Amino acid sequence: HMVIKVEKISGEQLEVAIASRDTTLIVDFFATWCGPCLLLARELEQVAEEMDGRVKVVKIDVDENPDLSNMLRIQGLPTIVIIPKDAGKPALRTEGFLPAAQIMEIVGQIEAG
Template identity: 40%
Template sequence: MSVISVVGKENLEAEVNSGVSIVDFYADWCGPCKMLTPVLEELATDLAGKAKVVKVNVDQNQELAAEFKIQGVPTIVIMKDGEVVERAVGFQPKAGLVDLVNKNL
């Protein structure tokens, strides 16, 4: 069972309103997004209790993607207590994502 939640407009806010969250804006057709999934699954396990990982499908949540000004996928948005604190576009190595999260813990 995956430790990553797939969320949409109706439940994103509840998922990211406290603590540090990694929000992956992705699309099913996106090659780099598919490459990022196992990295995020590892991170979700490694950071359990410190940060959570959620995914937002931009094709199914276009309004949410627009609200977050997503220009390309994958886009990783680091949120702390419901506020955007970091962004990274494109495939990110695990070490880079860990650094982004640790800066905001």
């Protein structure tokens, strides 16, 4: 006996994760060859740990999801989309590396809306 947070998902998985969300949702659109994406994935794991139960972080490989990446017009990597828990509180979309502290401030400001 032994015991066992940034989940890689697919386009179809993201559809429900968006419609079924209880918390703020952070979606990281990334590619495996992209430096800044690699670094951002580390910050996101820190965000997902330090705010466990306040956010769910998911990542989506654009190369594996070319349809969805075109549908959203993903132009720069990484692309981060933060969807607040409740409708009305509007979403945020940004491009480029963001330190975990900045990500946490953003989620915090969305919580007090």
